C-alpha cells in the first residue's frame, strides 16, 4: 500500500492511494467463468489467471459504477 511513500505526500494523497490500490489488488470474480482469479494487466486492462480471459474494465477496478448501468439499460 501507501507505506512505500514513507512520511511523504500527506494523509489524503496516500490514504486514497492505499484505498484505490487495496480494492485495485482485491480478488476479482471473472466474467467468463466465475472464479476470483482476475488481476489487472495494465491501465484499465484485466485478465483471469485461471482461463486467461483478458477484459476491458475500470482503471483500478475491473467494473465501474457506469459499466454496470450499461448491463441494465
Amino acid at each position: 500500500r501507501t507505506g512505500r511513500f514513507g512520511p511523504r505526500y500527506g494523509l489524503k494523497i496516500r490514504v486514497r492511494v492505499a484505498d484505490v490500490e487495496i480494492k485495485h489488488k482485491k480478488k476479482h470474480k471473472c466474467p467468463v467463468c466465475g472464479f476470483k482469479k482476475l488481476k489487472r494487466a495494465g491501465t484499465g486492462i484485466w485478465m483471469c489467471g485461471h482461463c486467461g480471459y483478458k477484459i476491458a474494465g475500470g482503471c483500478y477496478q475491473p467494473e465501474t459504477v457506469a459499466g454496470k448501468a450499461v448491463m441494465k439499460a
Binding site: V17, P31, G52, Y53, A56, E63, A66
Partner: protein, 237 residues
C-alpha cells in the same frame, strides 16, 4: 516584450508537439458498404499511449485487422458487429437511429461517417435521449444536449478505463511521465513568476497580476491570458 508561452506553442516545434510517431492507432469506426454483415473478433486488449485507456484489437470477417475504441467490458474472444442491423450489445456500433433510447453510448460521430468524435475518453459516455426521423438528441459528457443526425454511428456502452481521475499522481515524477506521452510542455511556470518582458502578469516587486485577470474575447494573442471571457469567477453566489 517577447512572445508569451501560448504564442511559442502554435509554431508547433518539437517541445509542443505530441509524440505522434509513438502512437498506435487513430481510432475510427469502420466503413461499411451497407447491410451490416460486418462482424469480427476481439483478438487482443492493448494500452493506448495517446489516451491512457485500453484499446481492443479486432479481426474482421473480410480480413481487416484494426484497433478499436473499446467499451468497458469487452474481452478476448468476444464478437462485435458494425452495421444498421448490428445487435444491441456492448462493443457494437450502429447509427443512433437503430439504438434504443435510454442507452449509454460512446465514440459518437459528429456527422454520419466521420468515424466518431464525442465521448471517447476514459470511462465517459453519451446518453441517447430522443429519437425522430430527423433529429437524434444526445447528452454529451459535458452535459450539453447535442442534436445529431440519426445516421451518426455510435458505440454501445461506456468507454473503458473508468475511474482514472480518481487516484492522485502523488508526486511530480508521475505527471512527468504522463506528460511525456502528450503534446504538452510540462511543467508550467506561473505568469506572475516571470518578468514584465515575458508575460502581462510579470514584473512587480511582489507576485501579483498587474491588471484584473478577466480578459476580453477580443484581446489579441500575446495578451489573452488569465480568465478568458469569464462569465464570472470565484465560488460565491
Amino acid at each position: 516584450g517577447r512572445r508569451i508561452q501560448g504564442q511559442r506553442r502554435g509554431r508547433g516545434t518539437s517541445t509542443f508537439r505530441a509524440p505522434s510517431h509513438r502512437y498506435k492507432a487513430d481510432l475510427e469506426h469502420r466503413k461499411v458498404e451497407d447491410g451490416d454483415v460486418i462482424a469480427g473478433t476481439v483478438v487482443d486488449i492493448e494500452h493506448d499511449p495517446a489516451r491512457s485507456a485500453p484499446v481492443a484489437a479486432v479481426e474482421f470477417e473480410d480480413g481487416d485487422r484494426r484497433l478499436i475504441l473499446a467499451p468497458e467490458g469487452v474481452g478476448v474472444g468476444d464478437e462485435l458487429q458494425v452495421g444498421v442491423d448490428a445487435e444491441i450489445a456492448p462493443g457494437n456500433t450502429l447509427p443512433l437511429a437503430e439504438i434504443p433510447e435510454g442507452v449509454p453510448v460512446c465514440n459518437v460521430e459528429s456527422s454520419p461517417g466521420d468515424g466518431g468524435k464525442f465521448a471517447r475518453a476514459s470511462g465517459v459516455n453519451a446518453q441517447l435521449l430522443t429519437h425522430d426521423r430527423n433529429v437524434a438528441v444526445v447528452k454529451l459528457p459535458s452535459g450539453e444536449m447535442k442534436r445529431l443526425d440519426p445516421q451518426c454511428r455510435a458505440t454501445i456502452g461506456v468507454v473503458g478505463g473508468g475511474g482514472r481521475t480518481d487516484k492522485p499522481f502523488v508526486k511530480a515524477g508521475n505527471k512527468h511521465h504522463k506528460m511525456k506521452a502528450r503534446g504538452t510542455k510540462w511543467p508550467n511556470v506561473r505568469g506572475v513568476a516571470m518578468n514584465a518582458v515575458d508575460h502581462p502578469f510579470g514584473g512587480g516587486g511582489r507576485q501579483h497580476p498587474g491588471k484584473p485577470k478577466s480578459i476580453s474575447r477580443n484581446a489579441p494573442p500575446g495578451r489573452k491570458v488569465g480568465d478568458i471571457a469569464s462569465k464570472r469567477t470565484g465560488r460565491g453566489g
